[PDB]
Write a protein that binds this ligand. Structure first.
Ligand SMILES: [Fe+3]
Ligand SMILES: [Zn+2]
Lengths: 249, 144, 450, 249
DNA sequence: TGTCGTCAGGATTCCAGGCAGTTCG
DNA sequence: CGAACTGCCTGGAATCCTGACGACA
């Protein structure tokens, strides 16, 4: 139960947990000898967020025993609003339900909070054949989704051999973006067959606005199977969103 | 609003349960509030009396003419669907806590009314949404 | 409590049996004709937040107007049809317009019709001061489509001449048949009620099974192959609290199961055509194909019971029937005088005079916004029907069969409050070999008077 | 009419559109061989706005037949909200009566929209007594409109042969904005008679929402006569407001 | 006459990209 | 002699308390 994690500057982790809170409120961080893990489902059982951070991310990391703790997303969002980019985040926990967040600098800050428990059921996602993989930049996808957000909500991604297309249909508007290997927004392609699927972009737009511009993304999808967008944190941690498309035309 | 009244009703039910030592039955005023609510909702949906935003006095006819001829803007309508959408979870939790008859028909009727008035368009491979309503529906189907 | 799972009686073996060819065909079916590929695509293009009821209403109005304009163009009498924008084109010419409305005024010159639609403003010296006087006086004022022919205004399209939306009366004779198939007008059954006539109903069912009494009845039932019926077998929940004491059976799914089991013991050579009613276990608005998956499982278990929709248009051997309930008749009887609840012929001709079930709005019948309009009648129907009127009156209007069904149970508390006597225990069985009748068998003396 | 227009300065185009946006939802663009003539009249009939952009401005200009278009402010602003300067602006059209906007450079964005056909009216350009012309700077115009948008509502312009003063009063405060050779914003002018005029502030404040800071806008007016506020861009394109004088209190 | 929902609306603070001042081969 | 690396600061936008509306008993 007791642990201590010290890191000089955690604005990335702050905005990450802010996006997780905007996604869902009930979340439990499992602390194991390897690091931290979290898996948040959806109240409408349509979206799944997963994150893992090993012990090669923060500066100081001392854990006693692997367990599962819970932190309120509202109480955390009421905490990250004071995180300076040049601060030293220190998360301390003992045996009692007291969580300490410490910051060292021009004034020693220390906030104590109660620790409630979360009992969300965890189940391993079954393996599914992707048949479509691609690695792109985050800024291009973010600006495309922000340009196609106001016209409609169903954005259609089509992928063929060395070809990608992001389109936005409708009745009084149409948007189209082409992507090839010699373009300025595609890093690499691993397409297998001709796939095409339309997805909603509310949670998409929120989660891609929460992520910075220089970060990269890896999309895995198929014909009509759910999409998985993954990315890496400091080349050590992993974070993946997963959500199914719509059946309509 | 909704938070204070819902919390007060839930706490009253909880304290009554503590007092009677976890032994109670269903109520009737919940239905006496829901059935007139459903009927009034249906009558408002079939009436659909609109009102122009800036043209506050001229009430626009239910026949849509695009916009108000005296004010080229949107026309405020009487949806009256947000109240029943918030009252449905109350009856759902009540029927999940206590089992009673003569009202599962009303529950499935109002749920299907909302469904086919909107007509849940996305679904994954792993569903299994727990619902005492669907459970009782399947039970009655098997009994039939 | 009762279950109605014991009425199992074999038909009359001594009755003359006959099994002939039974070509069964239909025309209207919302599950394959209305929601095929047009319903899911209305707008499908909105912002992050918005509404869809207004868009669906506009699409429904536009589709209805287009269908009515197509029908009036098919009518080979009206010409020179222009729109309100074409007001900038035509200057000095009497123009014809089949238009929507805003209000009606009874003046001395003609009729003063204020007209709104999706295009502009139409004033009319409408010709209701002509052969269509009673017609345009009985039409609906706030919601109708009337045909005007006359002058051009000074900015407002202001016609001046007569027209009602008539249906084609001159029709060709349908191909005759060599047998007799029947429509037995029975609606608003309301089974499992405290005032339902159970003994009379089971006796009528046993008589229809083959146990006849008269030689004419035996000759009429010896060749019956089709039995067209209205429906409306239950009432549902959501009427009034006193309905709790009105429920003679505690369950409703058990009522459905008992009704299906009682209607299953009928022979197989007699094909029954049944439909839903106003008190449906589905969307209270109109129209609706049928029941849910659970409420229609015994209906699927029954093979010969063709579950048609309500309203629904059926075509059989060149004969056109339609099964509807109708609720705008109350709006009509409240709008135009000289009408009564005991005038179902007049109410149904008022409904039929617009090629639509009920274009009125702001009434006691719901209509959900859907762009697909199906209440438009393509061809002249040969059998009309109503529902929840509980009165019977046979009518032949311009060769069109407009007949009412009535009811089969005792007088309810609402009828006692309104103090109107119903018409129960009525068996109007009609042959439509030439769009006609057969007879009206009555057994009211089989039950007590209410 | 299938046409193709290719140039650079999508940021400048978006700035011009935003300057000519809040007036009317649909402006009449005559797109002829000699270029784009955009006209619009305020619904309250207070200001007539017009721009003239010659053909020689665009790098690639292919036009088959002159036409007229009703440009919708909503869609035009929702599309031009992402105007950049490092890319190339392209507006194309085929046989269909639609509108196609291509965007190359950092990406490949294609926007297809249905061309709405709404009625329009033609207006003339009347000759007006012009006796007071001054070139103003964006910063000075912004500060003047800002100090005139807090308390004052009635402005009075008085242009003398050597200076320009603005007397502002809404209810109690007396503002006097005096400009002359003392500032670098007013170095060239042409005033032969002392001209006095009275105007408001809300329409100017709504119309100056798309002007630049380092820009030099020409302004010509006389004795209680309509005002002509013009400005040139790319040495060929011109954009001009036609403000009406307020004679009431 | 008590209650409950929706909507817009303008004033507010927070975030981000452009203008400006500054230390590096 | 030019290029990143900040402040900062002002435009753009998300949030929200207040002012309208209708519904039931
Ligand atoms: Fe009835
Ligand atoms: Zn009925």
């Amino acid at each position: 139960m007791p642990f201590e994690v010290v890191f000089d500057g955690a604005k990335e982790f702050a905005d990450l947990i802010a996006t997780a809170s905007n996604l869902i409120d009930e979340a439990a961080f499992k602390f194991t000898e390897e690091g931290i893990s979290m898996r948040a489902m959806d109240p409408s059982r349509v979206v799944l967020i997963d994150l893992n951070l090993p012990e090669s991310i923060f500066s100081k990391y001392e854990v006693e025993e692997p367990e599962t703790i819970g932190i309120n997303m509202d109480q955390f969002k009421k905490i990250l609003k004071r995180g300076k980019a040049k601060d030293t985040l220190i998360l301390r926990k003992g045996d009692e339900n007291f969580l300490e967040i410490t910051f060292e600098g021009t004034a020693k800050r220390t906030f104590r909070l109660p620790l409630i428990d979360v009992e969300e059921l965890e189940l391993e996602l079954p393996e599914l054949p992707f048949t479509a993989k691609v690695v792109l930049l985050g800024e291009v996808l973010k600006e495309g989704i922000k340009d196609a957000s106001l016209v409609s909500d169903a954005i259609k991604f089509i992928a063929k051999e060395n070809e990608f297309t992001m389109k936005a249909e409708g009745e009084t508007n149409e948007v189209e973006i082409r992507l090839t290997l010699e373009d300025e927004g595609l890093l690499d392609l691993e397409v297998e067959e001709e796939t095409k699927s339309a997805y909603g972009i509310r949670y998409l737009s929120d989660m891609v606005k929460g992520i910075g511009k220089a970060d990269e993304v890896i999309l895995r999808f198929g014909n009509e199977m759910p999409l998985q967008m993954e990315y890496m944190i400091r080349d050590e941690g992993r974070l993946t969103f997963l959500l199914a498309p719509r059946v309509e035309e | 609003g909704d938070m204070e009244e819902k919390v007060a009703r839930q706490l009253a039910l909880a304290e009554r349960i503590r007092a009677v030592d976890e032994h109670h039955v269903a109520e009737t005023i919940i239905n006496s509030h829901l059935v007139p609510d459903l009927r009034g909702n249906l009558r408002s949906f079939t009436r659909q009396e609109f009102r122009c935003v800036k043209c506050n006095t001229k009430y626009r006819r239910p026949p849509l003419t695009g916009k108000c001829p005296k004010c080229g803007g949107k026309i405020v309508l009487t949806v009256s669907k947000g109240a029943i959408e918030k009252y449905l979870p109350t009856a759902k939790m009540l029927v999940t806590k206590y089992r009673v008859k003569d009202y599962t028909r009303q529950r499935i009727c109002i749920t299907e009314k909302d469904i086919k008035t909107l007509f849940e368009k996305q679904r994954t491979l792993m569903g299994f949404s727990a619902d005492i309503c669907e459970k009782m529906v399947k039970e009655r189907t098997g009994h039939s | 409590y009762s279950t109605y799972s014991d009425l199992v009686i074999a038909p009359k073996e001594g009755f003359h049996y006959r099994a002939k060819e039974i070509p069964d065909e239909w025309e209207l079916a919302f599950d394959v004709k209305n929601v095929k590929f047009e319903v899911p695509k209305v707008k499908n293009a909105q912002s992050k937040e918005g509404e869809v009821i207004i868009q669906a209403y506009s699409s429904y109005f536009k589709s209805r107007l287009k269908k009515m304009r197509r029908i009036f163009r098919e009518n080979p009498e009206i010409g020179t049809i222009v729109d309100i924008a074409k007001l900038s084109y035509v200057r000095e010419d009497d123009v014809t317009i089949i238009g929507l409305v805003n209000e009606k005024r009874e003046t001395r010159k003609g009729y003063l019709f204020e007209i709104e639609d999706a295009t502009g403003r139409i004033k009319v010296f409408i010709g209701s001061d002509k052969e269509g006087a009673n017609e345009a006086y009985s039409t609906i004022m706030p919601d109708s489509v009337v045909a005007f022919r006359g002058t051009p205004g000074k900015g407002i399209f202001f016609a001046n001449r007569v027209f009602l939306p008539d249906v084609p009366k001159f029709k060709r004779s349908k191909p005759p048949l060599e047998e007799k198939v029947y429509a037995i007008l029975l609606s608003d059954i309301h089974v499992g009620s405290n005032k339902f006539c159970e003994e009379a109903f089971i006796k009528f069912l046993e008589w229809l099974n083959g146990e006849v009494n008269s030689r004419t009845e035996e000759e009429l039932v010896s060749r019956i192959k089709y039995i067209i019926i209205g429906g409306d077998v239950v009432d549902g929940v959501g009427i009034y609290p006193g309905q709790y004491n009105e429920l003679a059976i505690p369950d409703i799914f058990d009522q459905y199961e008992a009704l299906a089991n009682l209607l299953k013991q009928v022979p197989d050579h007699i094909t029954m055509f049944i439909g839903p009613g106003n008190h449906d276990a589905a969307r209270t608005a109109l129209p609706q194909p049928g029941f849910y998956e659970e409420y229609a499982k015994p209906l699927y278990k029954l093979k010969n019971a063709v579950i048609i929709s309500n309203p629904a248009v059926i075509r059989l051997h060149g004969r056109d029937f339609l099964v509807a309930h109708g609720r705008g008749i109350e709006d009509v009887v409240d709008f135009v005088p000289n009408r009564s609840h005991h005038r179902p012929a007049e109410a149904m001709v008022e409904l039929l005079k617009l090629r639509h079930i009920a274009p009125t709005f702001g009434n006691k019948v719901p209509i959900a916004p859907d762009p697909e309009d199906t209440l438009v009648i393509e061809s002249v129907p040969d059998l009309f029907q109503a529902g929840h009127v509980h009165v019977m009156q046979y009518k032949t209007y311009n060769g069109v069969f407009v007949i009412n069904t009535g009811t089969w149970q005792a007088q309810t508390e609402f009828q006692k409050m309104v103090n109107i006597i119903p018409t129960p225990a009525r068996v109007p069985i009609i042959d439509v070999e030439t769009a006609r009748l057969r007879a009206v068998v009555r057994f009211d003396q089989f039950c007590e008077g209410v």
